[PDB]
Amino acid sequence: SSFSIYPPIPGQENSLRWAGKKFEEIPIAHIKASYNNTQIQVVSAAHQPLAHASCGTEGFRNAKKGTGIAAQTAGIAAAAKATGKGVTHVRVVVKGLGPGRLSAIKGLTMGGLEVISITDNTPIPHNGCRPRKARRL
Amino acid sequence: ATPSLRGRLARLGNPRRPILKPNKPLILANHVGERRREKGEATCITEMSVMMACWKQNEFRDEACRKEIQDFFDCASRAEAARKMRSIQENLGELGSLPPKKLNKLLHRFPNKPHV
Amino acid sequence: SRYGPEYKDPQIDKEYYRKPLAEQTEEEKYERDFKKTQLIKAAPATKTSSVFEDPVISKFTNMMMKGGNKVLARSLMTQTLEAVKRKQFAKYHAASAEEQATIERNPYTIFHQALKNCEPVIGLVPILKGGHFYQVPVPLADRRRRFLAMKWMIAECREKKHRRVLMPEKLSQELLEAFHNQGPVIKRKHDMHKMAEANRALAHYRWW
Amino acid sequence: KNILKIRRRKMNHHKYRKLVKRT
Amino acid sequence: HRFMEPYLFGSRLGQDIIDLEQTAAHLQLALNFTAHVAYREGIILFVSRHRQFAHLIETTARDCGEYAHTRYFKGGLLTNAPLLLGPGVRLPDLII
Amino acid sequence: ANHLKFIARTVMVQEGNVEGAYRTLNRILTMDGLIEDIKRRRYYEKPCRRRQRESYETCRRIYNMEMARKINFLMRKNRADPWQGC
Amino acid sequence: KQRAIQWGEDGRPFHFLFYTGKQSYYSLMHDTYGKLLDVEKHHNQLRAKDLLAEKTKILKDPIGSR
RNA sequence: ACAGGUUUGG
RNA sequence: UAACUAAGCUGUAAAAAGCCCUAGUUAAAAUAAAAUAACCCACGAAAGUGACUCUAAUAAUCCUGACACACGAUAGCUAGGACCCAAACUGGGAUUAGAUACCCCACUAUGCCUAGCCCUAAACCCAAAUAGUUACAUAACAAAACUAUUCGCCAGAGUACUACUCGCAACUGCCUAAAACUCAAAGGACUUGGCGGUGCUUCACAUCCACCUAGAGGAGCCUGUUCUAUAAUCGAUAAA
RNA sequence: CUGAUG
Ligand SMILES: [Mg+2]
Ligand SMILES: [Mg+2]
Ligand SMILES: [Mg+2]
Ligand SMILES: [Mg+2]
Ligand SMILES: [Mg+2]
Ligand SMILES: [Mg+2]
Ligand SMILES: [Mg+2]
Ligand SMILES: [Mg+2]
Ligand SMILES: [Mg+2]
Ligand SMILES: [Mg+2]
Ligand SMILES: [Mg+2]
Ligand SMILES: [Mg+2]
Ligand SMILES: [Mg+2]
Ligand SMILES: [Mg+2]
Ligand SMILES: [Mg+2]
Ligand SMILES: [Mg+2]
Ligand SMILES: [Mg+2]
Ligand SMILES: [Mg+2]
Ligand SMILES: [Mg+2]
Ligand SMILES: [Mg+2]
Ligand SMILES: [Mg+2]
Ligand SMILES: [Mg+2]
Ligand SMILES: [Mg+2]
Ligand SMILES: [Mg+2]
Ligand SMILES: [Mg+2]
Ligand SMILES: [Mg+2]
Ligand SMILES: [Mg+2]
Ligand SMILES: [Mg+2]
Ligand SMILES: [Mg+2]
Numbered sequence A: 001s002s003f004s005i006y007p008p009i010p011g012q013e014n015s016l017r018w019a020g021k022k023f024e025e026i027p028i029a030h031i032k033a034s035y036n037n038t039q040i041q042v043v044s045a046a047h048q049p050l051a052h053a054s055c056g057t058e059g060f061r062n063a064k065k066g067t068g069i070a071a072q073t074a075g076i077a078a079a080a081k082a083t084g085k086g087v088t089h090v091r092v093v094v095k096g097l098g099p100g101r102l103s104a105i106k107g108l109t110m111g112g113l114e115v116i117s118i119t120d121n122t123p124i125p126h127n128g129c130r131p132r133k134a135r136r137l
Numbered sequence B: 001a002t003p004s005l006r007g008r009l010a011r012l013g014n015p016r017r018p019i020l021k022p023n024k025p026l027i028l029a030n031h032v033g034e035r036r037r038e039k040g041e042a043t044c045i046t047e048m049s050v051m052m053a054c055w056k057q058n059e060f061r062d063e064a065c066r067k068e069i070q071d072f073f074d075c076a077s078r079a080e081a082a083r084k085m086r087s088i089q090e091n092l093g094e095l096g097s098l099p100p101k102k103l104n105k106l107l108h109r110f111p112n113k114p115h116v
Numbered sequence C: 001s002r003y004g005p006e007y008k009d010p011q012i013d014k015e016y017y018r019k020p021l022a023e024q025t026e027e028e029k030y031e032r033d034f035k036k037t038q039l040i041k042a043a044p045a046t047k048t049s050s051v052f053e054d055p056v057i058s059k060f061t062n063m064m065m066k067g068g069n070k071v072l073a074r075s076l077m078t079q080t081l082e083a084v085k086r087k088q089f090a091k092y093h094a095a096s097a098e099e100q101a102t103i104e105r106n107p108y109t110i111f112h113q114a115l116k117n118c119e120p121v122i123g124l125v126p127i128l129k130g131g132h133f134y135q136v137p138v139p140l141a142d143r144r145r146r147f148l149a150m151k152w153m154i155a156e157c158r159e160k161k162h163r164r165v166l167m168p169e170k171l172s173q174e175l176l177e178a179f180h181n182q183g184p185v186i187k188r189k190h191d192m193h194k195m196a197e198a199n200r201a202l203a204h205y206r207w208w
Numbered sequence D: 001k002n003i004l005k006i007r008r009r010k011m012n013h014h015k016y017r018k019l020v021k022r023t
Numbered sequence E: 001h002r003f004m005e006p007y008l009f010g011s012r013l014g015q016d017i018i019d020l021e022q023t024a025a026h027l028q029l030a031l032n033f034t035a036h037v038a039y040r041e042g043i044i045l046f047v048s049r050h051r052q053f054a055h056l057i058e059t060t061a062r063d064c065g066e067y068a069h070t071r072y073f074k075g076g077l078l079t080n081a082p083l084l085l086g087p088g089v090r091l092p093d094l095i096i
Numbered sequence F: 001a002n003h004l005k006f007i008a009r010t011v012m013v014q015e016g017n018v019e020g021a022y023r024t025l026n027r028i029l030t031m032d033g034l035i036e037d038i039k040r041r042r043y044y045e046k047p048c049r050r051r052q053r054e055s056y057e058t059c060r061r062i063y064n065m066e067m068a069r070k071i072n073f074l075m076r077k078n079r080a081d082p083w084q085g086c
Numbered sequence G: 001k002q003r004a005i006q007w008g009e010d011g012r013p014f015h016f017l018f019y020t021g022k023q024s025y026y027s028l029m030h031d032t033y034g035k036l037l038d039v040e041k042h043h044n045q046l047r048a049k050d051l052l053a054e055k056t057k058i059l060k061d062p063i064g065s066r
Numbered sequence H: 001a002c003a004g005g006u007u008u009g010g
Numbered sequence I: 001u002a003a004c005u006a007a008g009c010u011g012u013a014a015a016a017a018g019c020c021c022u023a024g025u026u027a028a029a030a031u032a033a034a035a036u037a038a039c040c041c042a043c044g045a046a047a048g049u050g051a052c053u054c055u056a057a058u059a060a061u062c063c064u065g066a067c068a069c070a071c072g073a074u075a076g077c078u079a080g081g082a083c084c085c086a087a088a089c090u091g092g093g094a095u096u097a098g099a100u101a102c103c104c105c106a107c108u109a110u111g112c113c114u115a116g117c118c119c120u121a122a123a124c125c126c127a128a129a130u131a132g133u134u135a136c137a138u139a140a141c142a143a144a145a146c147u148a149u150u151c152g153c154c155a156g157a158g159u160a161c162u163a164c165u166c167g168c169a170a171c172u173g174c175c176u177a178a179a180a181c182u183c184a185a186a187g188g189a190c191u192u193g194g195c196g197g198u199g200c201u202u203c204a205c206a207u208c209c210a211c212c213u214a215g216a217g218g219a220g221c222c223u224g225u226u227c228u229a230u231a232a233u234c235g236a237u238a239a240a
Numbered sequence J: 001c002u003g004a005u006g
Helices: A067-082 A099-113 B043-056 B067-092 B100-109 C025-033 C053-065 C070-093 C108-116 C144-161 C169-179 C184-197 C200-205 D002-022 E018-039 E056-064 F020-030 F034-041 F047-078 G025-048
Strands: A028-033 A038-043 A049-054 A089-095 A114-120 C122-129 C131-138 E008-012 E016-018 E043-046 E068-069 F009-012
Touching: A028 A067, A028 A099, A028 F034, A038 A067, A038 A099, A049 A067, A067 A099, A089 A099, A099 A114, A099 F009, A114 F020, B043 C184, B043 C200, B043 F009, B067 C131, B067 F020, B100 F047, C053 C070, C053 C108, C053 C144, C070 C169, C108 C144, C108 C169, C108 C184, C122 C184, C131 C184, C144 C169, C144 C184, C184 F047, E018 E043, E043 E056, E056 E068, E056 G025, F009 F047, F020 F034, F034 G025
Parallel strands: A028 A089, A089 A114, E043 E068
Antiparallel strands: A028 A038, A038 A049, A114 F009, C122 C131, E008 E016
């Protein structure tokens, strides 16, 4: 049982299949987890969006969509709208450190989606644009 | 390893600018800080999952599947016994970790000597 | 509080002493229990060495008793057992020879089986985390489960009956329903199990 | 401590600046 | 300790070595001063706080007829003696 | 952006285990220092505070390392006292 | 009543642990430790000579001795 | 200057 | 800036305001800045400097030494250019009795480059430079106590980083810098209480929760209070 | 979350 946590780079001759497809054909699920909202959007391998569901579109409100239950419901709805189009496996791309980070991830499994690759793509500026000032002066 | 300390503080013999600005004098105290309510994790989660699987599959009845009901109780009893026996075994022994109540008495036997 | 720390619990079982030679491991502790000059508390007025009484029946009568009127709860339990026995005898005499080999008539057995059927498995504990209370599913002890199973039945027979229906008459039907697992106590137990299964995702919040 | 005299000089300089702005 | 440089002979790879010549000279002087006190009926108290030979020191003091002290040394023992020991006591004439 | 996709900060699950893979990915970022870096870059800090934070962290690390070293050096003397009652 | 005379007319204390604060308690501790060392050496000699003629007198359950 | 009084809970 | 998807996005402890030419993904110049390495301590006289490469280059066969000469962070000024992002000011939305503040949104000067000024900092390592010592020696704390040659300062505190002068591309400025008057104090460290709307730990066997029993808040009555009403008691009137 | 004075 030789299992490597490294992703199956297309440059190699590895044979890893999910539902008959290769790792390059598996759809993507972008989960932008901000500090006040968690958006989930499902796109195909050709960068074509399939399903879109956010904590705001789930019927929540200002402080209600910041909790983890809102991200879990958003993930359930996204998984439902994705399975409505016939998808099996997905690659989760997490963006931003928010409270609904793991909730939106487990929401897809609770709504019926198989998570195979969790990629953390968080924007880390190499001292680029100057961010806002500090609070509690 | 331990980071270097030469040429860090502000002294008369140091010709460069001091690098480290200590809030308090870097003297090793004779008593460690008390651990902020060392906690533990739950138990028998995997045994409860396979137990509730019977309820979700057979429509919430215990007469259908039984071993998933007995192993759960066995895990609960073993956890209840380990919560009471280890709470004394680990406080009597010192193989692994130890509370600060003993670290303080261990350090006071061989304290630091700031003077002389 | 009048019993100091040196007072231990009594031992009412006569058979525990009627065979002291048949074993050595039990003799080893019984030969020192008195040689240590250990003081023993007084035998309770509700518990005796009678072979027809049961600690489960005693606990249920104590939980049913309101205030301090003990004879009222005793008579209620007697009437309940009598009604159960007579209804089972009626069902036995109104059945055929095939159902006679399956229908039981033991009131103690029916009561204990009903309690075992109504005994829950896992409960819910409110844990405060992040300023909110979450109902974490937690395994309960045997005494906790039995106490909940008895209290649910007692509360249902107290509040969910009619003024014309008596407590023994209502409990005689509740026990027969709990024996066949078709009663509101089993319904409440299944509701508890469903609410625990719906919250099992919060099991990582428990610390014991 | 020394913040007494520091704040004293601060208040004096602030009053001087306000006087300059007024006149 | 800084006051051991004149009483040390050298250092063999970190471990210091004591000069046994001066050791024996000081030991001769110490034993002479100890014998004279015991001859002149002097109270000799072996004070030594070390939990390895506390039994040996007490046995030596018992066999010598002199007094020993290897337990927790109290604060006002020798100073506040008229309150710790008794009304009027006789302090040890020699401490070892 | 210009680098290849699904290579940097990627963890492959095994047998559909999601929680363990997420904990592994999180430990990766904590050991690499990205979690604290993002939590610090959320709001801009001035160099007057940056130097102070660096000095504080250096002193804290030095003190913790010295305490751990002395604890590991004195752990031998934790055994039962063989000279009790002397 | 109070404590008896500790030192004679010459001033020399009678007991050998008078300068310890508890000339009775510390003497008892010393005698107990001496008997313990003697018993330890006796048991070691017995183990070396392959002789086990003693028993464990610690279980005082039927006696009730505290 | 052979000095003393005077700040402060001290 | 273009293409697909959705009616929502940002926003706080909670909201509102703002934007719905909005939001996510795929691509995308110009400008600003330069993650980890850094637990490193080097360079430079100091301020200062750590995204990469190239050219030039970092004085004194080496004492101290100005009011002379030359530099001198951010902030400010002038002219030209740039403007992603942050933001003085300003306009709104919260909270407060009030908030022209801390909280949220938009936006400007400004932060960015060249040329020319202004020459200020807790410019603090509050410890001057040059060659050394561990001798005597703890006011307190702090970075232990000191030698020989020097440079520049120090005469109670407030008045006072003030006015009057001189000089300065500076003109609400900078350097130098008093006096009248008021008081017998003004100051640094320390010891102990008190306090803290800054912290950490501890347990309560009717106690906080996990939990058990019986009660008040629903009806009437009694009784005691706070109120209206009279010429018509009073005290108590948070745990207590 | 906020709460002024003696
Ligand atoms: Mg400090
Ligand atoms: Mg401290
Ligand atoms: Mg003034
Ligand atoms: Mg004073
Ligand atoms: Mg609005
Ligand atoms: Mg542009
Ligand atoms: Mg950079
Ligand atoms: Mg230098
Ligand atoms: Mg040079
Ligand atoms: Mg020169
Ligand atoms: Mg602009
Ligand atoms: Mg902006
Ligand atoms: Mg405004
Ligand atoms: Mg500028
Ligand atoms: Mg400048
Ligand atoms: Mg500076
Ligand atoms: Mg200065
Ligand atoms: Mg002192
Ligand atoms: Mg000079
Ligand atoms: Mg003056
Ligand atoms: Mg100035
Ligand atoms: Mg001026
Ligand atoms: Mg209570
Ligand atoms: Mg009543
Ligand atoms: Mg009422
Ligand atoms: Mg009333
Ligand atoms: Mg009254
Ligand atoms: Mg009154
Ligand atoms: Mg009064």
